[PDB]
Design an enzyme around this catalytic site. Structure first.
Site, mmCIF file in Angstrom:
data_model
loop_
_atom_site.group_PDB
_atom_site.id
_atom_site.type_symbol
_atom_site.label_atom_id
_atom_site.label_comp_id
_atom_site.label_asym_id
_atom_site.label_seq_id
_atom_site.Cartn_x
_atom_site.Cartn_y
_atom_site.Cartn_z
ATOM 1 N N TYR A 280 -1.206 -4.405 -5.964
ATOM 2 C CA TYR A 280 -0.906 -4.961 -4.628
ATOM 3 C C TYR A 280 -1.907 -4.588 -3.548
ATOM 4 C CZ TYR A 280 2.053 -6.875 -0.930
ATOM 5 O OH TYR A 280 2.626 -7.702 0.000
ATOM 6 N N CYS B 42 2.346 -3.463 16.855
ATOM 7 C CA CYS B 42 2.000 -3.254 18.250
ATOM 8 C C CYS B 42 1.277 -4.438 18.891
ATOM 9 C CB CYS B 42 1.222 -1.963 18.473
ATOM 10 S SG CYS B 42 2.257 -0.484 18.237
ATOM 11 N N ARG C 133 2.613 -11.357 2.417
ATOM 12 C CA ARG C 133 1.256 -11.600 2.919
ATOM 13 C C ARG C 133 0.757 -13.011 2.728
ATOM 14 N NH1 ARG C 133 -1.290 -6.877 5.158
ATOM 15 N NH2 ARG C 133 0.434 -5.388 4.835
ATOM 16 N N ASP D 226 -9.034 -7.139 11.598
ATOM 17 C CA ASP D 226 -8.533 -5.879 10.991
ATOM 18 C C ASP D 226 -9.458 -4.693 11.004
ATOM 19 O OD1 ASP D 226 -6.212 -4.513 9.630
ATOM 20 O OD2 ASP D 226 -7.616 -4.471 7.941
ATOM 21 N N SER E 25 0.610 -0.396 13.618
ATOM 22 C CA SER E 25 1.432 -1.486 13.093
ATOM 23 C C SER E 25 2.511 -1.882 14.086
ATOM 24 C CB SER E 25 2.068 -1.069 11.771
ATOM 25 O OG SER E 25 2.636 0.213 11.909
ATOM 26 N N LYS F 1 -9.088 -1.440 2.513
ATOM 27 C CA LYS F 1 -8.871 -0.146 3.152
ATOM 28 C C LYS F 1 -9.662 0.986 2.491
ATOM 29 C CE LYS F 1 -5.856 -1.869 6.090
ATOM 30 N NZ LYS F 1 -6.202 -1.892 7.547
ATOM 31 N N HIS G 280 -10.374 0.699 12.488
ATOM 32 C CA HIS G 280 -9.293 -0.239 12.233
ATOM 33 C C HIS G 280 -9.101 -1.065 13.474
ATOM 34 C CE1 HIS G 280 -4.718 -0.697 10.952
ATOM 35 N NE2 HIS G 280 -5.482 -1.715 10.456
ATOM 36 N N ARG H 108 0.865 -1.167 0.000
ATOM 37 C CA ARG H 108 0.000 0.000 0.000
ATOM 38 C C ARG H 108 0.918 1.238 0.000
ATOM 39 N NH1 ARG H 108 -1.083 2.748 4.269
ATOM 40 N NH2 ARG H 108 -0.817 1.218 5.966
HETATM 41 N N1 LIG Z 1 6.891 -8.983 24.081
HETATM 42 C C1 LIG Z 1 5.751 -9.116 23.338
HETATM 43 N N2 LIG Z 1 5.851 -9.054 21.997
HETATM 44 C C2 LIG Z 1 4.757 -9.190 21.206
HETATM 45 C C3 LIG Z 1 3.437 -9.397 21.811
HETATM 46 N N3 LIG Z 1 2.550 -9.481 20.794
HETATM 47 C C4 LIG Z 1 3.254 -9.350 19.635
HETATM 48 N N4 LIG Z 1 4.565 -9.192 19.903
HETATM 49 C C5 LIG Z 1 5.671 -8.996 18.925
HETATM 50 O O1 LIG Z 1 5.593 -7.689 18.353
HETATM 51 C C6 LIG Z 1 5.760 -7.743 16.921
HETATM 52 C C7 LIG Z 1 4.464 -7.324 16.238
HETATM 53 O O2 LIG Z 1 3.423 -8.200 16.657
HETATM 54 P P1 LIG Z 1 2.132 -8.349 15.710
HETATM 55 O O3 LIG Z 1 1.107 -9.115 16.509
HETATM 56 O O4 LIG Z 1 2.618 -8.934 14.396
HETATM 57 O O5 LIG Z 1 1.771 -6.768 15.529
HETATM 58 P P2 LIG Z 1 0.722 -6.068 14.512
HETATM 59 O O6 LIG Z 1 1.591 -5.533 13.385
HETATM 60 O O7 LIG Z 1 0.097 -4.965 15.345
HETATM 61 O O8 LIG Z 1 -0.217 -7.177 14.084
HETATM 62 C C8 LIG Z 1 6.145 -9.174 16.599
HETATM 63 O O9 LIG Z 1 7.572 -9.203 16.635
HETATM 64 C C9 LIG Z 1 5.579 -9.983 17.762
HETATM 65 O O10 LIG Z 1 6.315 -11.167 18.083
HETATM 66 C C10 LIG Z 1 3.403 -9.450 23.280
HETATM 67 O O11 LIG Z 1 2.333 -9.644 23.895
HETATM 68 N N5 LIG Z 1 4.563 -9.302 23.952
HETATM 69 MN MN LIG Z 2 -3.319 -7.998 10.918
HETATM 70 MN MN LIG Z 3 -4.808 -3.072 8.921
#
Ligand SMILES: Nc1nc2c(ncn2[C@@H]2O[C@H](COP(=O)(O)OP(=O)(O)O)[C@@H](O)[C@H]2O)c(=O)[nH]1
Ligand SMILES: [Mn+2]
Ligand SMILES: [Mn+2]
Ligand code: NA
Length: 604
Positions: A226, A279, A396, A302, A277, A235, A255, A78
């Site tokens: 993409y 998080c 993805r 999402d 992102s 989106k 979101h 995106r």
């Molecule tokens: N320490 C810790 N790391 C986490 C947790 N949840 C996700 N992560 C890590 O943070 C990064 C992003 O997590 P993700 O779930 O993919 O984030 P998204 O991009 O918001 O979906 C990855 O490296 C995960 O392993 C958590 O509860 N604790």
């Molecule tokens: Mn996701």
């Molecule tokens: Mn999203």
């Protein structure tokens, strides 16, 4: 009359306005054929085999009906800088920042968009099929669902839209003579090709433009094949166009993941959660909870569409039909529910392929049997020693939601699920406790407004920064207005931070499935339990209120510590940000919460 070029379906059987939209754009774009999608497995299976034969996709022989597409490295995400919303007045689309450019959207004049469109779409589908994709965002015929029609010259888009939305004949039948969102897409490579095709992936990076015209209920996208640029429901429709309609109509398009949580007593609650992102969003939506007798199930991972019902309940639906997830980091060890989902009937984009016809990526945490080799997303031999990653960081999976082993039984209920808590998330190594609870709705809206992306450096209010369909100040006013709806049962609002670190740089909280313990606390707070201590930032769990059983020595004092000097800096930072980026459009209530927080910190 383009009847002679129709290779599936019939222009005659289309609703009047749909035919006008098809034919008008066939005239403009000059496709060789028109294929009106039926959504059948027959159509899908043949389209995939075709793409395969053409080298556009590879079949993944290790799995049941899984496929791999590798893109032109120029078209891998995106693209925010080419993403614009068109309105008569700039201010209705973005606030006017005190200086510089808005971080909260990107407006284009009607006049400039007209010139851009004329420079791109005439003749753009020459020698290609125009596919007509009739799709429902949300369960078919749900009062909360909305219908679109997407015209595209990309079979990849057709296959991915079948997974990500409900599409086909039944949608046209449900649509009848009703209103729909007009979605026009082209890869922008009419035949004969004017430029070299890279990796059998048609695109036009120089002319890439993704436009939204909310007053016309139109989305028009050129040059990218993409994800968020080409799958227009995701989106462009379900956040940008939808948030504007929601503003008009009194609901919310957000979101947010939606989850259903069941305690050991069998009592079930639904929560929505917005995260920027990196998080923790996907890990939470797919949570395998560690606490005995707790269950977590996923309605959506999402987007959420939420509307207060007659009884005052905030009802949410997932308007999507599939997960379009970032692949790298999806771990066989710590995200088992995502892994199970993607084992069949899944389209992968820009991930690595193993010599046994499997998929691979950074953070899969699954050692390969000795002998098994890896081909990268760039189609080059690859070894774990190498400099570059084997999968593009934005690669993805595109997978049917129904295949998620924890898909919620009400994920397609037409009336939606009753949201009792909203969670805002972030990633802060310092100063922000593991969880806290807003003092009021108005305080809650401020907390969402103050959200930061990973690391705490940049602002991503409500995790909507790239997605606001209109002026962010007006969006805040819209949220604040929910409090004045009679009988509204306003969800409790929390803020979470899985990522706080000690002085050594180590996470203070184990997270992942252990975050079930934080959900348990939220659940109890919604039921009215006296498990909270008041602080200047909101309510936090009391001493001993968290279930720490099984975690050994958790430093809750540090994990929940609130520092006057940290929070002074934080309030000054938010103040500056809101003045710069929102200014004249900042709601009174938000400024009032800012002053209230500053004052509570000042008395520490
Ligand atoms: N320490 C810790 N790391 C986490 C947790 N949840 C996700 N992560 C890590 O943070 C990064 C992003 O997590 P993700 O779930 O993919 O984030 P998204 O991009 O918001 O979906 C990855 O490296 C995960 O392993 C958590 O509860 N604790
Ligand atoms: Mn996701
Ligand atoms: Mn999203
Ligand atoms: Na390719």
């Amino acid at each position: 009359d383009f009847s002679a070029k129709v290779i599936q379906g019939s222009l005659d059987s289309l609703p009047q306005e749909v035919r006008k939209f098809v034919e008008g754009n066939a005239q403009l774009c000059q496709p060789e054929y028109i294929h009106i999608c039926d959504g059948s497995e027959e159509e899908y299976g043949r389209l995939l085999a075709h793409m395969q034969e053409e080298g556009v996709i590879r079949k993944l022989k290790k799995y049941d009906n899984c496929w791999l597409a590798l893109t032109d490295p120029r078209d891998v995400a995106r693209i925010e800088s080419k993403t614009v919303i068109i309105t008569q007045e700039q201010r209705d689309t973005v606030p006017i920042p005190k200086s510089g450019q808005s971080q909260l959207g990107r407006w284009m004049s009607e006049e400039d968009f007209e010139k851009a469109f004329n420079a791109r779409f005439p003749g753009c589908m020459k020698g290609r099929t125009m596919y007509v994709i009739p799709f429902s965002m949300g369960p078919l015929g749900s009062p909360l669902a909305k219908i679109g029609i997407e015209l595209t010259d990309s079979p990849y888009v057709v296959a991915s839209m079948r997974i990500m939305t409900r599409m086909g004949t039944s949608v046209l039948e449900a649509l009848g003579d009703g209103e729909f969102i007009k979605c026009l897409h082209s890869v922008g490579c009419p035949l004969p090709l004017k430029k070299p095709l890279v990796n059998n992936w048609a695109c036009n990076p120089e002319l890439t433009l993704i436009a939204h015209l909310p007053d016309r209920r139109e989305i028009i996208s050129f040059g990218s094949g993409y994800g968020g640029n080409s799958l227009l429901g995701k989106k462009c429709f379900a956040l940008r166009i939808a948030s504007r309609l929601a503003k008009e109509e009194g609901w919310l398009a957000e979101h947010m993941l939606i989850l259903g949580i069941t305690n050991p007593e069998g009592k079930k609650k639904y929560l929505a959660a917005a995260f920027p992102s990196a998080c923790g969003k996907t890990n939470l939506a797919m949570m395998n909870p560690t606490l005995p007798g707790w269950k977590v199930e996923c309605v959506g991972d999402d987007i959420a569409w939420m509307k207060f019902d007659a009884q005052g309940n905030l009802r949410a639906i997932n308007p999507e039909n599939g997960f379009f997830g970032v692949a790298p980091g999806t771990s066989v060890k710590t995200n088992p529910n995502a892994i199970k989902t993607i084992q069949k009937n899944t389209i992968f984009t820009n991930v690595a392929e193993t010599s046994d016809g499997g998929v691979y990526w950074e953070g899969i945490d699954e050692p390969l049997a000795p002998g098994v080799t890896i081909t990268s997303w760039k189609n080059k031999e690859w070894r774990p020693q190498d400099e570059e990653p084997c999968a593009h960081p934005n690669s993805r999976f595109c997978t049917p939601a129904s295949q998620c082993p924890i898909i919620d039984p009400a994920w397609e209920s037409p009336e939606g699920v009753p949201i009792e808590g909203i969670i805002f998330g972030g990633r802060r190594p310092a100063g922000v406790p593991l969880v806290y609870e807003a003092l009021s709705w108005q305080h809650g809206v401020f907390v969402g407004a103050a959200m930061r992306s990973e690391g705490g450096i940049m602002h991503d209010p409500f995790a909507m920064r790239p997605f606001f369909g209109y002026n962010f100040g007006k969006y805040l006013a819209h949220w604040l207005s929910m409090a004045h709806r009679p009988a509204a049962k306003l969800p409790k609002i929390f803020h979470v931070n899985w990522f706080r670190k000690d002085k050594n740089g180590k996470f203070l909280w184990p997270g992942f499935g252990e975050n079930s313990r934080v959900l348990e606390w939220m659940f109890g707070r919604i039921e009215g339990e006296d498990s909270a201590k008041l602080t200047p930032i909101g309510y936090v769990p009391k001493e001993d209120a968290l279930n720490l059983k099984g975690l050994g020595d958790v430093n809750v004092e540090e994990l929940f510590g609130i520092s006057k000097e940290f929070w002074e800096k934080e309030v000054e930072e938010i103040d500056k940000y809101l003045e710069d980026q929102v200014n004249a459009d900042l709601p009174y209530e938000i400024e009032r919460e800012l002053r209230a927080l500053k004052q509570r910190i000042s008395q520490m």
